[PDB]
Amino acid sequence: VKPNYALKFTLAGHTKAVSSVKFSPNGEWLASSSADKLIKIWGAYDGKFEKTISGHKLGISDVAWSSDSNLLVSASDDKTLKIWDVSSGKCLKTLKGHSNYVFCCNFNPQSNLIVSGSFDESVRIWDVKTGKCLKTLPAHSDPVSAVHFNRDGSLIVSSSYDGLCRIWDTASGQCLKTLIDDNPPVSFVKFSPNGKYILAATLDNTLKLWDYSKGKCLKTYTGHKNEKYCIFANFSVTGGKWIVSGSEDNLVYIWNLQTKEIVQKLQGHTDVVISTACHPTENIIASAALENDKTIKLWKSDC
Protein backbone atom coordinates (compact mmCIF):
# COMPACT_ATOMS: atom_id res chain seq x y z
CA VAL A 1 0.00 0.00 0.00
CA LYS A 2 1.36 3.36 -1.12
CA PRO A 3 -0.13 6.81 -1.57
CA ASN A 4 -0.95 8.66 -4.77
CA TYR A 5 -0.51 12.33 -3.84
CA ALA A 6 -1.36 14.52 -6.84
CA LEU A 7 -0.94 18.28 -7.18
CA LYS A 8 -4.12 20.27 -6.53
CA PHE A 9 -3.08 23.90 -6.02
CA THR A 10 -0.04 26.13 -6.31
CA LEU A 11 -0.22 29.17 -4.03
CA ALA A 12 1.82 32.17 -5.21
CA GLY A 13 2.27 35.45 -3.39
CA HIS A 14 5.39 35.41 -1.22
CA THR A 15 8.18 37.51 -2.75
CA LYS A 16 11.07 35.75 -1.01
CA ALA A 17 11.69 32.18 0.10
CA VAL A 18 8.98 30.45 2.07
CA SER A 19 10.16 29.13 5.42
CA SER A 20 7.23 27.28 7.04
CA VAL A 21 3.68 26.12 6.37
CA LYS A 22 1.26 24.76 9.01
CA PHE A 23 -2.34 23.60 8.83
CA SER A 24 -4.70 24.94 11.46
CA PRO A 25 -5.88 22.34 14.00
CA ASN A 26 -9.48 22.70 12.77
CA GLY A 27 -8.15 21.86 9.31
CA GLU A 28 -9.61 24.88 7.53
CA TRP A 29 -6.48 27.02 7.03
CA LEU A 30 -2.90 26.85 5.87
CA ALA A 31 -0.54 29.43 7.32
CA SER A 32 2.73 30.27 5.55
CA SER A 33 5.71 32.28 6.80
CA SER A 34 8.46 33.68 4.67
CA ALA A 35 11.79 35.46 4.41
CA ASP A 36 9.67 38.36 3.03
CA LYS A 37 8.71 39.20 6.67
CA LEU A 38 5.09 38.19 6.06
CA ILE A 39 2.58 35.56 7.09
CA LYS A 40 -0.09 34.56 4.56
CA ILE A 41 -3.31 32.64 5.29
CA TRP A 42 -4.79 30.28 2.71
CA GLY A 43 -7.86 28.07 2.47
CA ALA A 44 -6.76 24.46 2.95
CA TYR A 45 -9.28 22.93 0.54
CA ASP A 46 -9.68 25.48 -2.28
CA GLY A 47 -6.27 27.17 -2.10
CA LYS A 48 -7.93 30.58 -1.89
CA PHE A 49 -5.72 33.36 -0.55
CA GLU A 50 -7.32 34.88 2.54
CA LYS A 51 -5.07 37.57 4.03
CA THR A 52 -1.52 38.79 4.63
CA ILE A 53 -0.25 39.40 8.16
CA SER A 54 2.62 41.84 8.66
CA GLY A 55 4.63 43.56 11.36
CA HIS A 56 7.94 41.78 11.78
CA LYS A 57 10.94 43.92 10.83
CA LEU A 58 12.97 40.99 9.40
CA GLY A 59 12.33 37.56 7.94
CA ILE A 60 10.29 34.85 9.65
CA SER A 61 11.61 31.31 10.09
CA ASP A 62 8.58 29.56 11.60
CA VAL A 63 4.93 29.89 12.50
CA ALA A 64 2.49 27.82 14.55
CA TRP A 65 -1.18 27.70 15.59
CA SER A 66 -2.96 27.69 18.95
CA SER A 67 -5.12 24.65 19.57
CA ASP A 68 -8.38 26.56 18.99
CA SER A 69 -7.14 27.85 15.56
CA ASN A 70 -7.57 31.48 16.61
CA LEU A 71 -3.96 32.47 17.32
CA LEU A 72 -0.70 32.30 15.41
CA VAL A 73 2.82 32.79 16.73
CA SER A 74 5.73 33.72 14.48
CA ALA A 75 9.49 33.51 15.05
CA SER A 76 11.58 36.17 13.31
CA ASP A 77 15.09 37.44 12.65
CA ASP A 78 14.10 40.69 14.35
CA LYS A 79 14.73 38.59 17.52
CA THR A 80 11.08 38.61 18.58
CA LEU A 81 8.12 36.31 18.46
CA LYS A 82 4.70 37.80 17.76
CA ILE A 83 1.26 36.53 18.75
CA TRP A 84 -1.40 37.18 16.12
CA ASP A 85 -5.17 37.22 16.22
CA VAL A 86 -5.92 35.40 13.00
CA SER A 87 -9.40 36.92 12.48
CA SER A 88 -8.27 40.54 12.78
CA GLY A 89 -4.62 40.24 11.71
CA LYS A 90 -3.53 42.35 14.71
CA CYS A 91 -0.35 41.67 16.64
CA LEU A 92 -1.58 40.93 20.16
CA LYS A 93 1.85 40.63 21.83
CA THR A 94 5.54 40.97 20.96
CA LEU A 95 7.75 38.49 22.82
CA LYS A 96 11.14 40.06 23.54
CA GLY A 97 14.11 38.50 25.28
CA HIS A 98 16.03 36.40 22.77
CA SER A 99 19.42 37.88 21.94
CA ASN A 100 19.71 36.44 18.41
CA TYR A 101 17.22 35.55 15.86
CA VAL A 102 14.30 33.23 16.66
CA PHE A 103 14.22 30.08 14.57
CA CYS A 104 11.36 27.87 15.79
CA CYS A 105 8.17 28.05 17.83
CA ASN A 106 5.08 26.08 18.96
CA PHE A 107 2.06 26.35 21.22
CA ASN A 108 1.43 23.67 23.80
CA PRO A 109 -1.86 21.74 23.62
CA GLN A 110 -3.39 23.93 26.33
CA SER A 111 -2.24 26.90 24.23
CA ASN A 112 -1.44 28.92 27.34
CA LEU A 113 2.32 28.52 26.70
CA ILE A 114 4.64 29.12 23.76
CA VAL A 115 8.04 27.45 23.32
CA SER A 116 10.75 29.00 21.17
CA GLY A 117 14.29 28.27 20.07
CA SER A 118 16.86 30.81 18.92
CA PHE A 119 20.31 31.15 17.44
CA ASP A 120 21.19 32.58 20.86
CA GLU A 121 21.25 28.80 21.74
CA SER A 122 18.46 29.00 24.37
CA VAL A 123 14.92 27.62 24.55
CA ARG A 124 12.30 29.94 26.01
CA ILE A 125 8.82 29.31 27.42
CA TRP A 126 6.36 32.22 27.22
CA ASP A 127 2.98 33.08 28.76
CA VAL A 128 0.49 33.50 25.90
CA LYS A 129 -1.84 35.77 27.88
CA THR A 130 0.76 38.28 29.12
CA GLY A 131 3.49 37.83 26.51
CA LYS A 132 6.06 37.51 29.27
CA CYS A 133 8.99 35.11 29.45
CA LEU A 134 8.48 32.47 32.12
CA LYS A 135 11.64 30.38 31.67
CA THR A 136 14.86 30.61 29.70
CA LEU A 137 16.49 27.21 29.28
CA PRO A 138 20.23 27.15 28.50
CA ALA A 139 19.36 24.30 26.24
CA HIS A 140 22.18 23.90 23.74
CA SER A 141 25.67 25.05 22.69
CA ASP A 142 24.68 26.02 19.13
CA PRO A 143 21.57 27.34 17.31
CA VAL A 144 18.34 25.58 18.28
CA SER A 145 16.73 24.18 15.12
CA ALA A 146 13.38 22.95 16.50
CA VAL A 147 11.12 22.90 19.55
CA HIS A 148 8.01 20.79 20.08
CA PHE A 149 5.51 20.04 22.87
CA ASN A 150 4.33 16.47 23.36
CA ARG A 151 0.68 15.41 23.21
CA ASP A 152 -0.22 16.91 26.59
CA GLY A 153 2.44 19.61 26.90
CA SER A 154 4.23 17.92 29.81
CA LEU A 155 7.42 17.65 27.71
CA ILE A 156 9.39 19.74 25.22
CA VAL A 157 11.85 18.22 22.73
CA SER A 158 14.57 20.47 21.29
CA SER A 159 17.34 20.02 18.73
CA SER A 160 20.41 21.94 17.74
CA TYR A 161 23.34 22.18 15.40
CA ASP A 162 25.35 21.00 18.44
CA GLY A 163 24.30 17.43 17.62
CA LEU A 164 21.81 16.79 20.44
CA CYS A 165 18.11 16.41 21.03
CA ARG A 166 17.04 17.11 24.59
CA ILE A 167 13.72 16.42 26.31
CA TRP A 168 12.68 18.99 28.91
CA ASP A 169 10.08 18.80 31.64
CA THR A 170 7.87 21.81 30.93
CA ALA A 171 6.84 22.68 34.47
CA SER A 172 10.41 22.72 35.83
CA GLY A 173 12.48 23.50 32.74
CA GLN A 174 14.79 20.70 33.86
CA CYS A 175 16.31 18.33 31.30
CA LEU A 176 14.98 14.79 31.35
CA LYS A 177 16.91 13.08 28.51
CA THR A 178 19.64 13.72 25.93
CA LEU A 179 19.69 11.38 22.92
CA ILE A 180 23.23 11.01 21.60
CA ASP A 181 26.80 6.96 17.89
CA ASP A 182 27.83 10.35 16.43
CA ASN A 183 26.69 14.01 16.49
CA PRO A 184 25.96 15.47 13.08
CA PRO A 185 23.93 18.70 13.35
CA VAL A 186 20.31 17.98 14.24
CA SER A 187 18.14 20.07 11.94
CA PHE A 188 14.61 19.14 13.08
CA VAL A 189 12.80 17.13 15.74
CA LYS A 190 9.23 16.48 16.79
CA PHE A 191 7.10 14.10 18.81
CA SER A 192 4.77 11.53 17.27
CA PRO A 193 1.01 12.13 17.77
CA ASN A 194 0.86 9.59 20.61
CA GLY A 195 3.98 11.18 22.13
CA LYS A 196 5.85 7.87 22.35
CA TYR A 197 8.46 8.48 19.64
CA ILE A 198 10.42 11.43 18.31
CA LEU A 199 11.43 11.99 14.68
CA ALA A 200 14.82 13.69 14.27
CA ALA A 201 16.60 14.88 11.13
CA THR A 202 20.36 15.28 10.94
CA LEU A 203 22.32 17.11 8.25
CA ASP A 204 23.76 13.81 6.96
CA ASN A 205 20.68 13.16 4.76
CA THR A 206 19.12 11.11 7.55
CA LEU A 207 15.82 10.96 9.43
CA LYS A 208 15.54 8.79 12.52
CA LEU A 209 12.67 7.50 14.64
CA TRP A 210 13.55 7.21 18.33
CA ASP A 211 11.75 5.53 21.19
CA TYR A 212 11.66 8.29 23.79
CA SER A 213 11.46 5.96 26.82
CA LYS A 214 14.48 3.72 26.03
CA GLY A 215 16.36 6.30 23.95
CA LYS A 216 16.81 3.84 21.06
CA CYS A 217 16.75 4.44 17.31
CA LEU A 218 13.98 2.34 15.78
CA LYS A 219 14.11 3.36 12.10
CA THR A 220 16.27 5.33 9.69
CA TYR A 221 14.88 6.92 6.53
CA THR A 222 17.34 8.02 3.83
CA GLY A 223 17.56 8.70 0.11
CA HIS A 224 16.45 12.31 0.37
CA LYS A 225 19.00 15.16 0.39
CA ASN A 226 19.49 17.17 3.58
CA GLU A 227 22.88 18.71 4.35
CA LYS A 228 22.28 22.47 4.55
CA TYR A 229 18.74 23.39 5.61
CA CYS A 230 16.50 22.80 8.63
CA ILE A 231 13.69 21.02 6.75
CA PHE A 232 10.41 20.08 8.47
CA ALA A 233 9.32 16.44 8.69
CA ASN A 234 5.98 14.97 9.79
CA PHE A 235 4.04 11.92 10.78
CA SER A 236 1.24 11.37 8.27
CA VAL A 237 -1.51 9.47 10.10
CA THR A 238 -4.79 10.23 8.27
CA GLY A 239 -4.41 7.42 5.74
CA GLY A 240 -1.43 5.15 5.45
CA LYS A 241 1.23 5.61 8.13
CA TRP A 242 3.93 7.68 6.45
CA ILE A 243 6.91 9.85 7.19
CA VAL A 244 6.94 13.03 5.07
CA SER A 245 9.80 15.45 4.53
CA GLY A 246 11.09 18.11 2.21
CA SER A 247 14.44 17.71 0.56
CA GLU A 248 17.19 19.74 -1.06
CA ASP A 249 16.63 18.03 -4.44
CA ASN A 250 13.33 19.99 -4.82
CA LEU A 251 11.18 16.92 -4.08
CA VAL A 252 8.73 15.92 -1.38
CA TYR A 253 9.75 12.53 0.01
CA ILE A 254 7.31 10.02 1.49
CA TRP A 255 8.31 6.82 3.31
CA ASN A 256 6.53 3.84 4.73
CA LEU A 257 7.05 4.40 8.45
CA GLN A 258 7.46 0.67 9.02
CA THR A 259 9.40 -0.67 6.04
CA LYS A 260 11.39 2.61 5.61
CA GLU A 261 10.81 2.40 1.86
CA ILE A 262 10.45 5.57 -0.19
CA VAL A 263 6.84 5.13 -1.42
CA GLN A 264 6.37 8.43 -3.31
CA LYS A 265 8.36 11.50 -4.43
CA LEU A 266 6.38 14.61 -5.42
CA GLN A 267 7.80 16.56 -8.33
CA GLY A 268 6.98 20.16 -8.87
CA HIS A 269 8.98 22.57 -6.83
CA THR A 270 11.88 24.36 -8.50
CA ASP A 271 13.89 24.89 -5.30
CA VAL A 272 14.62 23.24 -1.97
CA VAL A 273 11.42 22.04 -0.29
CA ILE A 274 12.13 23.54 3.14
CA SER A 275 8.76 22.73 4.69
CA THR A 276 6.02 20.16 4.58
CA ALA A 277 2.89 19.69 6.69
CA CYS A 278 0.18 17.05 6.94
CA HIS A 279 -3.49 17.93 7.22
CA PRO A 280 -5.08 16.83 10.55
CA THR A 281 -8.01 14.92 8.98
CA GLU A 282 -7.60 14.67 5.18
CA ASN A 283 -4.87 13.03 3.11
CA ILE A 284 -3.43 16.42 2.14
CA ILE A 285 0.19 17.60 2.12
CA ALA A 286 1.32 21.20 1.94
CA SER A 287 4.87 21.84 0.74
CA ALA A 288 6.92 24.98 0.20
CA ALA A 289 10.22 26.03 -1.33
CA LEU A 290 13.11 28.50 -1.25
CA GLU A 291 13.83 31.68 -3.19
CA ASN A 292 13.94 30.36 -6.75
CA ASP A 293 10.45 28.84 -6.30
CA LYS A 294 8.73 30.87 -3.51
CA THR A 295 5.50 28.87 -3.83
CA ILE A 296 3.38 26.54 -1.74
CA LYS A 297 1.83 23.40 -3.19
CA LEU A 298 -1.22 21.55 -1.85
CA TRP A 299 -1.32 17.84 -2.70
CA LYS A 300 -4.08 15.25 -2.22
CA SER A 301 -4.05 11.44 -2.02
CA ASP A 302 -6.83 8.83 -1.96
CA CYS A 303 -5.04 7.10 0.91
Binding site: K16, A17, S19, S20, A35, G59, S61, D62, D77, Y101, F103, F119, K228, Y229, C230, I274, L290, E291
Partner: peptide, 6 residues
Protein backbone atom coordinates in the same frame (compact mmCIF):
# COMPACT_ATOMS: atom_id res chain seq x y z
CA UNK B 1 17.47 32.29 9.57
CA UNK B 2 15.94 29.14 8.11
CA UNK B 3 16.17 30.09 4.43
CA UNK B 4 20.03 30.30 4.58
CA UNK B 5 22.39 27.29 4.21
CA UNK B 6 25.01 25.57 6.37
Amino acid sequence: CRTLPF
